[PDB]
Amino acid sequence: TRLSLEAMLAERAMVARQDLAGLKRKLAGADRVLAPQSPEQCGRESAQAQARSVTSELKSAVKEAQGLEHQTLDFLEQLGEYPVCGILHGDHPVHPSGTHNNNGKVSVKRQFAAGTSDALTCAFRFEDSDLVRETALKTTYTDGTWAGFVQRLKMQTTRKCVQEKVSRKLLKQLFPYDPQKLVDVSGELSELVLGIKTNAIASAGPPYWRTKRDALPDMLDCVLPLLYDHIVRKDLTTLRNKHPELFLAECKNKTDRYEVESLGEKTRPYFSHPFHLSALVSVLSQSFSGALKIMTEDSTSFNAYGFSWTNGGAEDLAIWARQAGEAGKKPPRIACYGDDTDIYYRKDGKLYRICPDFKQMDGSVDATTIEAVVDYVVDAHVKQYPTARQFWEEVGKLWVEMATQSPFLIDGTKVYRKMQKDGLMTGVVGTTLFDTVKSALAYNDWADQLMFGSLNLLEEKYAIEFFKNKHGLVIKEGTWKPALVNEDPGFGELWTEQKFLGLQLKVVRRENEKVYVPNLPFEDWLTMWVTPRSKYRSKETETMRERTLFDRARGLLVTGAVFDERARGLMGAVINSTAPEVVCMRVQEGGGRGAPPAYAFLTRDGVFEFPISDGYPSYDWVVSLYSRDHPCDMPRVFPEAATLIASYRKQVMDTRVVI
Amino acid sequence: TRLSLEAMLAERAMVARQDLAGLKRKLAGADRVLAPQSPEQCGRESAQAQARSVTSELKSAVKEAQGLEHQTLDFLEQLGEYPVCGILHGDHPVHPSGTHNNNGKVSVKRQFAAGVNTSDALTCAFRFEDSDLVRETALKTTYTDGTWAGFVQRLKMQTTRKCVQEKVSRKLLKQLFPYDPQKLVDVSGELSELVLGIKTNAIASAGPPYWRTKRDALPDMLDCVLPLLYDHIVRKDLTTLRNKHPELFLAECKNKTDRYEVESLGEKTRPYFSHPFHLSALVSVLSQSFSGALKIMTEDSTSFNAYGFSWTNGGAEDLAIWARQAGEAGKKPPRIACYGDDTDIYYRKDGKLYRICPDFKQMDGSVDATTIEAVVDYVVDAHVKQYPTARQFWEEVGKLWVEMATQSPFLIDGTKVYRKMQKDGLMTGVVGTTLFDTVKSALAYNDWADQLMFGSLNLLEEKYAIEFFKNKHGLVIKEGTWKPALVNEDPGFGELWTEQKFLGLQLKVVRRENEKVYVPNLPFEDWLTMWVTPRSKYRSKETETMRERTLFDRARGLLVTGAVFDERARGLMGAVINSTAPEVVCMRVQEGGGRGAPPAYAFLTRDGVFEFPISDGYPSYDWVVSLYSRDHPCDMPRVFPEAATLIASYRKQVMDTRVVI
Ligand SMILES: [Mg+2]
Ligand SMILES: [Mg+2]
């Protein structure tokens, strides 16, 4: 008696899905269920050479833009230099020795490196050569450029803003929430802070200069109680003046997909705040976003922050939109998510959709909006939990400061500050909500003006002037183009050609029912496919790179690529060309279910889980994800994999037989 | 990727306990709770040299004994050679290519290696204990493969003894071995699910034709051989299978690596038989179900069965309560408990309680075929009476069980296949060995007890008892081991019931709060023998960390088994625990499901599974006594009370959000 044979089998299975050579051998000749795929266009040698040619040209384009000189930073206030923080936690300084330290002053260095071929090689292997080359040459995943970084930083720290007229009553109307879903912030702080969610590998900011996971004990055990003590004694000025690095941010260039042709003019900045400040404010921010209604749940709400497409969401959007009324008679339907908007109105009874773009919206976010949002979120909590009002009002003051006036490093030891409170410091906790409110306030006023009779605000020329003069918002010319909505699309038809949250809305068939699903043209799926958000990693083994392609193919199929013939066929070719042992190996990501899709708005929580790491997204299964309460199993690539790997298939052996 | 800080901390803690360098640093100034310990007696240098001298002398004794010539194997029937099994499972033969194959015939090679156990534990004993005693104790016993000479000598002894057929019926077995029929497994279920329920040792040999560990051979056994076996059972066609694939019924006769007395290495090495996995797993359905249903003597006063007795949670005291019911010899029934070849006998003479603990000499040679067949029939009948729709299948399995216990062909060394000349004599290692031994012993002691009631009170005396067990039951009682002892029926704190052992342990009373607690006990010298003779040989790639952690785990196991109740044994184990490095105490460990390897002693609990509460606690007197107490639960003390927060580098501080500012 050590263990049951059943337990023995279970343990053998765990080890077996870790033996790639063993999986290869045991899956040999197994029945494989193949996804639909496009036919091969060229051989491995040609596909790889064609991908290398594109990559070489892009590397050259990046190197040239990265060589451009950049403007001076004179548009910011200069604050001198900060001393490296000396606070100790036990045996070590919280600011690690010999890092981010130039002769005792805090220092940083911006990364603009000039360093994706695997996915591009696949696209050339299975898709049209000219189309793949032309698409892949337009966009690249890059650190960007000094010149474009400074240009964009200037644009969002020097804009003339308009202070919004906003009150708690108005925000209740535009952003209703469920008070019973707010976290009880009159509880103990440690336990509240331990509840916030964040990215384990994101930077903890100054003074930690480490990942959040590495810095977490220093933040929790050492800095947070120090911060708390000075908050409640109203003594933050002493802490700031003695330990300025505790309130210092870092201004960083965002590595991202960028258009090759504007690399020299556009790289997006964002700000990385100290871990203790962002974690503390996240208690309010994440509690509030968790409690917000979205527009499909409450027709007075302008909020789409929280909207998600699966489980009927896509159709919820359309049902909500069809309620839009005749302009100048009845309310339009306006949904705001960060700087993204979906606008519906009727003219002569016909439904129209507008999907305009703001230019560098964060530069237009005025300080009055920022303070009103903080006050609205704080007041929501203290109305429900009034015994903790004063503590969280102090936190709200920290939040406003972080969003508007934190000092920050860029490159070297020079500390900077924005000249004015106006302009949102992108990346601060709550960025998305600040953007959403500013947009909704502007569109709410727009809708009021329609009811006042100014129906020419339906027209681009006057709309652009209105948003600029009355709200300090820049609507990109050419983006205000009302489109006739196909209100009840037929099978395979689009709602409109416009995108919201990065996706089109389409109707497809399941049985004989219409299902609303996300969609994109092939070229847009291809752009995402060929520009993975990962740099050359020598660590990445052939097996890991092979598995990455499989996971990314699954992710795009679930996001809607299964509903485009070519995109579906490309992802299917990737899946079909994945080795059996790579399909069936044990994987870490997704809790062993396989890495979830990159697209953030499939579900409200943001966490999507594949049912199994060795399934693939068939049309039927993905459609079932977008249908309401209509479930389908994810199909296995190798139906017999479990028993093949275990080298055992149960046979019923009856003990009751006559002998 | 996106996680709560709470989950982030939990994940950090997991990583932290795998980083020995980090643990060492974070536990450096940690406040340590010390177990009671003996003081250091000599330095490391002197302790290692003294240990080296002992191992060197033992290695020499073993090599010489292993050189002794062995007697011939002519006392067995010889059956020729068997062909290597050719059955394929998918892409491979069930009998691995290029192993156990001599020109197409099945072959084995007995291992009699000259490597003893390790010297780490012996070094600790020299470090913290008296030099003469450690040396004298260590020279007496060694963990060894044994010798050819002793192996064959012992094999002959248990395959050639004249046995006495027992007079036994289902009615008598019901009387001596009551069981709960509702606890029997429903063997009219589907066979696969029944076989997947049996428990065995993942790394034991799967036997012929697999020649692999049970873990490695399991899919071959389950998916390939078992259904083949099943098909031939239900078609009454086993003869076809045996004649075509004889390796499917072949056993291996093996020398048991074990602790052995150095001075008898040449005369005594234990044989046992390793049967094919498919046979032992199939029969284990009945055997393990039956032992799960058996009553033990402390639950039913008619039962002679202690197979299933366990010491913790009041068991030790249950034994004493049960024993005190023994009556005046020749007037009222004694109290007799049988476990394998071990017995505990109680009777009263002039009202005074006496205890006998005799030893059988190689009892398996004495187990007669009538007893074996009766035990199988009783176990089968119990199941088919409770589950009558499966009578015929399990009656066929019972026939296989009897063959495996009495007549399986077997290899020893080379290709020669042998068989025991007679049915009599139990093939030690067959599934059910313990029960077969237990029934044979109980049948004999039941007859002994009957003779007392008939007036034969001279059977209380060794001379007449030994003659009776030989002549009436073919059992050999070892001279000098029938020595009735006055029992201390109500021992005071620190006092023994008797100095005798049962299941390897003495019975003692100790104090907990203000109550008496009955606990297992041993003299220091016996704990020391076990401590210095680990059941493990030298293994390369066994890092110092693993070796240090093994000493820690073995010290815990001995303390829990009863060493905490002997002052010197407690002090030696405590010295080892206290000298274990903090990072070794607090590191993450695999054994015991992350709680630390459980004690080697098998009878702490009935199911056999013992789990430590935490891998970084130590067994204090208070905690161990609580395990033997009837309910009284106690927490296992941590060696480093602050380890968790030190390792996490975080200790919660209450920060009130309701403050006025
Ligand atoms: Mg848009
Ligand atoms: Mg005994």
Numbering used by the authors:
A (entry chain A): 11 to 125, 128 to 671
B (entry chain B): 11 to 671
Paper lines:
Thosea asigna virus (TaV) is a (+) ssRNA virus that infects the larvae of a defoliating moth (Setothosea asigna) and the prototypic member of the Permutotetraviridae family. In a previous work we have structurally and functionally characterized the non-canonical RdRP domain of TaV (TaVpol: residues 1-674 of the ORF1 product), showing close resemblances with flaviviral RdRPs. In these enzymes, motif C is located upstream of motif A forming a noncanonical C–A–B–D arrangement with a unique connectivity of the major structural elements of the active site. Here we report the X-ray structures of TaVpol captured in three replication-elongation states, revealing high resolution mechanistic details of different events in the nucleotide addition cycle for a non-canonical RdRP.
The X-ray analysis of the Δ10-TaVpol construct, crystallized in the presence of large amounts of Mg2+ (19% PEG 3350, 0.18 M MgSO4), revealed the existence of a second metal ion-binding site located nearby the catalytic cavity, in a non-catalytic position. The Mg2+ ions were located at 7 Å from the catalytic aspartate D351 (motif C), coordinated by the side chain carboxyl oxygen of D352 (motif C) and five water molecules, in a perfect octahedral geometry. The presence of non-catalytic Mg2+ ions at the polymerases central cavity were previously described in other RdRPs and recently, the role of these ions in the nucleotide addition cycle has been reviewed by Gong and collaborators. The position of the noncatalytic Mg2+ in Δ10-TaVpol perfectly match that identified in other RdRP structures prior to active site closure.
